[PDB]
């Protein structure tokens, strides 16, 4: 019953862990029992100094014996100078699938409880090292699948999003203290400037409208695009992948945990993470239909076009190295298509045009409303519009000139809604949900 | 052309890395350029001390700009007090699939070269911090898929295997200096005790024979068993897995990188890692044939038995909760089977008997010749027998009583063969092959 209050000492595995990959694996412990557990588990030879921000060498051993568990490194982060602001220790094990398990188990046995998803980064927020926008954005950092998705996440982490919103809430709180002091103290204050505070709302709701503009970029860099490739057999679907993948793959270096099929399908086009799925995919945001220009449009092309035409579509005209130049514009295709691209897959050319076509079909809303790499998410934008509505709800009731009693209801609503975002005023259901979608160890 | 000589400064990703899992990911740099690269890349606020074994907080930034790449922790390991004995730095990034890539790239740009498989742990050996048996066993540690496979690997790491072999090589070198001084200095030394040194060989070849006994345990804990489950549809194959898996799974806690299907199939029986494959599997060491005791043996049972009978086989008689007690011994099955087990899969009982049957079918050679958790591998055992052969080759030529000239050839061979194991005398082809089967970052 009810988190929001730090009571125990928590431990979890802090790194990805796969059976025969990766040199090292961490186990992180945080809480008032942290150093006590490192104390009773880590054997550090030849009197090394046990201070904060000090690396130690030794052996994690006794499970009630002295039976050595790993040759490990110990990290100490004491004081409020840690991730969670609590005392933090880290065991740096070899870690296949065995050592970390063994060490974690020894932690639970020494009075640590198993941390829940996001619980480390919650305790960070709970001790006022982070606000919600920051907490949220570190999940965005490790969740990023493109260089600019990270850039956007890093901006969130850095506080670039927490600073404006907390600034705006202060403003509403200030023009709330003005109205609330007049309503209570007889004279002792000259009357309100009825149209100066319609100009203050016009300032605030303007800034929060600039933020709500980024919302689209946010959804794209976070979720990315789900792209299906359809076509007939021997048209060049697999050939299309290779060409596109080689110049657009998200993984350019060999990466221990990840399997080649995710390295192959997870790529990036003009900043947007693009994920290639494997007539079936209505789960796709955009579909690439591939026909063979060497034989031109066929009946098999028509039918699978009939299945996918309701979804955003790009016709990929493959094997143009086989048609001669003068006859390219002569090639037949159903007239409703507005996005056609000629590619020579085996020759690895055309993917530059494919990119332009994919970016084009996306920038019909506003992908050219982008300013910098700061972008809010769904939940943040949800609370911002609701703060905007409630804010111009007051922007109406002061032109009607009701008494100060019927101004204060809606202003509070705006302050509370902005309080949701940074987290000075959040329901615990909202709070639990935020951290529940974090992975374990985070 | 030719490793075996440290020239550059190397960098690689030291942890497993999967797209949306694991709180942190390391990038390790080692060499004379290590600290210089941390210098020019890690922004550490408010003058923190830059000493060895010190944890630093800050921001990995400029790619020729100042553009922040991650909020990271820096680890410094200077002097010969490191993994590789060189100067070692570690960047501890957030790491999804983006941050570590970004940081590694910035390392290559600052004069680091990308480390090759095992190259860190080779440089450790190359600077005499480890012998080959130890180097080999750290790959065994992260490669282990059972608690005792780790225990065995840790023994190797600890030096429990390097100590005896280097001891034995010294002995051969000593009884080589005795013979070689007599052959060269006129008198100046009383003649050899011809049957004292047949007793010395009887001591050495005895100890190296005790080691060669473990070879079997070694192969089992390293490779483990590949077990296939065959049967007809609706017999209880999937039901068998669950029951067996729940009390024998190798992963008892939630582990970021690994997928449920590897958590499900990778289990352990009496110490041996057992991997469950998915009429087809001759790639299996042991097969479990499952029939349905409720309907008894069928014709479909017979045919798939005809496919798998040449492989070691255990008949799993499933659904015994449906046959009544007196009629169990009455159930018909082909007479050549010597290993039958009754299981009630849905009721989760029988897996204790299955274990006993699986251990039984394996301990026909010598799995009860085991003493402790020290066990040599294929390559080590290969060089040991060859040292043994060459050692009793001398154990013959001194009973024939040839001159001291025709003793020295074979003794050297034994010393050289034992020199292969710890690594004081290795071909570079052997050396390259050893580290080539390590994963990257290791
Ligand atoms: N090994 C490792 N463990 C982790 O828990 C971890 C990494 N690496 N890499 C990134 C880091 C997240 N970043 C942080 C954030 C704050 C502090 C910290 O000590 N708190 C102080 C700063 C110290 C100072 O100013 O001197 C603070 O008050 O913010 C440390 C690391 N992180 C988690 O993913
Ligand atoms: N973060 C991290 N990085 C690593 O490279 C690493 C881990 N963890 N965990 C286990 C460790 C392998 N173990 C070692 C071995 C030797 C030293 C070392 O500093 N060498 C000295 C010991 C220092 C002393 O005696 O005070 C030596 O001479 O052996 C450090 C870690 N290892 C890699 O997988
Ligand atoms: N000339 C030419 N041949 C191609 C091109 N793309 C694919 N092919 C050939 O067409 C065959 C079928 O391609 P494939 O990728 O397997 O099509 P899929 O079955 O839809 O995956 C392959 O043998 C390729 O060599 C192209 O752009 N030009
Ligand atoms: N009474 C009984 N029923 C079982 C047992 N094992 C499996 N079943 C039932 O038999 C059905 C088929 O089992 P299943 O695991 O799917 O067999 P598979 O098709 O070979 O994978 C399931 O619906 C189970 O409920 C058992 O030990 N006892
Ligand atoms: Zn194909
Ligand atoms: Zn036509
Ligand atoms: Zn089945
Ligand atoms: Zn019969």
PDB file of C-alpha atoms in Angstrom, chain A residues 231-337:
ATOM      1  CA  UNK A 231       5.684  -7.226 -53.042  1.00  0.00           C
ATOM      2  CA  UNK A 232       5.574 -10.376 -55.147  1.00  0.00           C
ATOM      3  CA  UNK A 233       8.259 -13.127 -54.960  1.00  0.00           C
ATOM      4  CA  UNK A 234      11.538 -12.308 -56.772  1.00  0.00           C
ATOM      5  CA  UNK A 235      10.775  -8.593 -57.001  1.00  0.00           C
ATOM      6  CA  UNK A 236      13.691  -7.530 -54.776  1.00  0.00           C
ATOM      7  CA  UNK A 237      12.266  -7.121 -51.278  1.00  0.00           C
ATOM      8  CA  UNK A 238      15.266  -8.657 -49.460  1.00  0.00           C
ATOM      9  CA  UNK A 239      17.499  -6.830 -51.944  1.00  0.00           C
ATOM     10  CA  UNK A 240      15.780  -3.546 -51.014  1.00  0.00           C
ATOM     11  CA  UNK A 241      16.471  -4.115 -47.298  1.00  0.00           C
ATOM     12  CA  UNK A 242      20.243  -4.615 -47.717  1.00  0.00           C
ATOM     13  CA  UNK A 243      20.689  -1.470 -49.811  1.00  0.00           C
ATOM     14  CA  UNK A 244      18.561   0.650 -47.465  1.00  0.00           C
ATOM     15  CA  UNK A 245      20.060  -0.936 -44.335  1.00  0.00           C
ATOM     16  CA  UNK A 246      23.725  -0.507 -45.348  1.00  0.00           C
ATOM     17  CA  UNK A 247      23.477   3.296 -45.519  1.00  0.00           C
ATOM     18  CA  UNK A 248      20.795   3.797 -42.824  1.00  0.00           C
ATOM     19  CA  UNK A 249      21.246   1.107 -40.100  1.00  0.00           C
ATOM     20  CA  UNK A 250      21.028   2.278 -36.474  1.00  0.00           C
ATOM     21  CA  UNK A 251      23.795  -0.099 -35.334  1.00  0.00           C
ATOM     22  CA  UNK A 252      27.095   0.774 -37.078  1.00  0.00           C
ATOM     23  CA  UNK A 253      29.323  -1.164 -34.621  1.00  0.00           C
ATOM     24  CA  UNK A 254      29.227  -4.712 -33.229  1.00  0.00           C
ATOM     25  CA  UNK A 255      27.032  -4.720 -30.119  1.00  0.00           C
ATOM     26  CA  UNK A 256      27.194  -7.795 -27.751  1.00  0.00           C
ATOM     27  CA  UNK A 257      23.550  -8.348 -26.725  1.00  0.00           C
ATOM     28  CA  UNK A 258      21.742  -7.543 -29.979  1.00  0.00           C
ATOM     29  CA  UNK A 259      20.976 -10.112 -32.709  1.00  0.00           C
ATOM     30  CA  UNK A 260      21.621  -9.463 -36.430  1.00  0.00           C
ATOM     31  CA  UNK A 261      17.899  -9.450 -37.306  1.00  0.00           C
ATOM     32  CA  UNK A 262      17.323  -6.409 -35.050  1.00  0.00           C
ATOM     33  CA  UNK A 263      20.531  -4.843 -36.406  1.00  0.00           C
ATOM     34  CA  UNK A 264      19.075  -5.378 -39.889  1.00  0.00           C
ATOM     35  CA  UNK A 265      15.491  -4.132 -39.380  1.00  0.00           C
ATOM     36  CA  UNK A 266      16.115  -1.256 -36.940  1.00  0.00           C
ATOM     37  CA  UNK A 267      17.381   1.700 -38.961  1.00  0.00           C
ATOM     38  CA  UNK A 268      17.063   5.508 -39.121  1.00  0.00           C
ATOM     39  CA  UNK A 269      15.859   7.882 -41.860  1.00  0.00           C
ATOM     40  CA  UNK A 270      16.461  11.621 -41.417  1.00  0.00           C
ATOM     41  CA  UNK A 271      16.414  11.335 -37.625  1.00  0.00           C
ATOM     42  CA  UNK A 272      13.293   9.175 -37.319  1.00  0.00           C
ATOM     43  CA  UNK A 273      13.816   5.623 -36.021  1.00  0.00           C
ATOM     44  CA  UNK A 274      12.411   3.365 -38.735  1.00  0.00           C
ATOM     45  CA  UNK A 275      11.531  -0.228 -37.902  1.00  0.00           C
ATOM     46  CA  UNK A 276      10.981  -2.702 -40.769  1.00  0.00           C
ATOM     47  CA  UNK A 277       8.305  -5.349 -40.069  1.00  0.00           C
ATOM     48  CA  UNK A 278       8.319  -8.980 -41.302  1.00  0.00           C
ATOM     49  CA  UNK A 279      -0.671  -8.259 -47.335  1.00  0.00           C
ATOM     50  CA  UNK A 280      -0.839  -8.555 -43.508  1.00  0.00           C
ATOM     51  CA  UNK A 281       0.739  -5.463 -41.935  1.00  0.00           C
ATOM     52  CA  UNK A 282      -1.947  -2.929 -41.070  1.00  0.00           C
ATOM     53  CA  UNK A 283       0.227  -2.624 -37.979  1.00  0.00           C
ATOM     54  CA  UNK A 284       2.426  -0.440 -40.220  1.00  0.00           C
ATOM     55  CA  UNK A 285       2.290   3.366 -40.420  1.00  0.00           C
ATOM     56  CA  UNK A 286       3.768   3.386 -43.917  1.00  0.00           C
ATOM     57  CA  UNK A 287       3.929   0.676 -46.596  1.00  0.00           C
ATOM     58  CA  UNK A 288       6.441   0.242 -49.426  1.00  0.00           C
ATOM     59  CA  UNK A 289       4.954  -1.702 -52.339  1.00  0.00           C
ATOM     60  CA  UNK A 290       7.623  -3.232 -54.566  1.00  0.00           C
ATOM     61  CA  UNK A 291       6.988  -4.173 -58.198  1.00  0.00           C
ATOM     62  CA  UNK A 292       9.448  -5.380 -60.850  1.00  0.00           C
ATOM     63  CA  UNK A 293      10.086  -2.766 -63.582  1.00  0.00           C
ATOM     64  CA  UNK A 294      11.683  -5.418 -65.819  1.00  0.00           C
ATOM     65  CA  UNK A 295       8.284  -7.079 -66.372  1.00  0.00           C
ATOM     66  CA  UNK A 296       6.247  -4.015 -65.385  1.00  0.00           C
ATOM     67  CA  UNK A 297       2.997  -4.040 -63.418  1.00  0.00           C
ATOM     68  CA  UNK A 298       1.306  -7.440 -63.125  1.00  0.00           C
ATOM     69  CA  UNK A 299      -1.964  -8.899 -61.882  1.00  0.00           C
ATOM     70  CA  UNK A 300      -0.261 -10.114 -58.688  1.00  0.00           C
ATOM     71  CA  UNK A 301       0.854  -6.520 -58.166  1.00  0.00           C
ATOM     72  CA  UNK A 302      -2.748  -5.312 -58.463  1.00  0.00           C
ATOM     73  CA  UNK A 303      -4.305  -7.611 -55.862  1.00  0.00           C
ATOM     74  CA  UNK A 304      -1.807  -6.898 -53.071  1.00  0.00           C
ATOM     75  CA  UNK A 305      -2.174  -3.218 -53.954  1.00  0.00           C
ATOM     76  CA  UNK A 306      -5.896  -3.610 -53.319  1.00  0.00           C
ATOM     77  CA  UNK A 307      -5.032  -4.854 -49.801  1.00  0.00           C
ATOM     78  CA  UNK A 308      -2.672  -2.005 -48.879  1.00  0.00           C
ATOM     79  CA  UNK A 309      -4.010   1.097 -50.679  1.00  0.00           C
ATOM     80  CA  UNK A 310      -5.854   2.470 -47.615  1.00  0.00           C
ATOM     81  CA  UNK A 311      -2.502   2.800 -45.780  1.00  0.00           C
ATOM     82  CA  UNK A 312       0.069   5.521 -46.627  1.00  0.00           C
ATOM     83  CA  UNK A 313       1.935   4.062 -49.593  1.00  0.00           C
ATOM     84  CA  UNK A 314       5.144   4.474 -51.580  1.00  0.00           C
ATOM     85  CA  UNK A 315       5.512   2.539 -54.833  1.00  0.00           C
ATOM     86  CA  UNK A 316       9.039   1.184 -55.175  1.00  0.00           C
ATOM     87  CA  UNK A 317       9.780   0.534 -58.820  1.00  0.00           C
ATOM     88  CA  UNK A 318      12.610  -1.985 -58.603  1.00  0.00           C
ATOM     89  CA  UNK A 319      15.266  -3.135 -61.110  1.00  0.00           C
ATOM     90  CA  UNK A 320      15.390   0.084 -63.202  1.00  0.00           C
ATOM     91  CA  UNK A 321      18.844  -1.024 -64.370  1.00  0.00           C
ATOM     92  CA  UNK A 322      16.912  -3.400 -66.679  1.00  0.00           C
ATOM     93  CA  UNK A 323      14.618  -0.806 -68.305  1.00  0.00           C
ATOM     94  CA  UNK A 324      16.188   1.647 -70.757  1.00  0.00           C
ATOM     95  CA  UNK A 325      16.156   5.380 -69.951  1.00  0.00           C
ATOM     96  CA  UNK A 326      13.563   6.651 -72.482  1.00  0.00           C
ATOM     97  CA  UNK A 327      10.992   4.063 -71.354  1.00  0.00           C
ATOM     98  CA  UNK A 328      11.084   4.801 -67.584  1.00  0.00           C
ATOM     99  CA  UNK A 329       8.347   7.472 -67.677  1.00  0.00           C
ATOM    100  CA  UNK A 330       6.415   4.980 -69.841  1.00  0.00           C
ATOM    101  CA  UNK A 331       6.046   2.374 -67.038  1.00  0.00           C
ATOM    102  CA  UNK A 332       2.443   1.780 -65.925  1.00  0.00           C
ATOM    103  CA  UNK A 333       1.171   1.913 -62.337  1.00  0.00           C
ATOM    104  CA  UNK A 334      -2.244   2.656 -60.757  1.00  0.00           C
ATOM    105  CA  UNK A 335      -2.978   6.370 -61.057  1.00  0.00           C
ATOM    106  CA  UNK A 336      -3.850   7.091 -57.393  1.00  0.00           C
ATOM    107  CA  UNK A 337      -0.250   6.609 -56.204  1.00  0.00           C
TER     108      UNK A 337
END
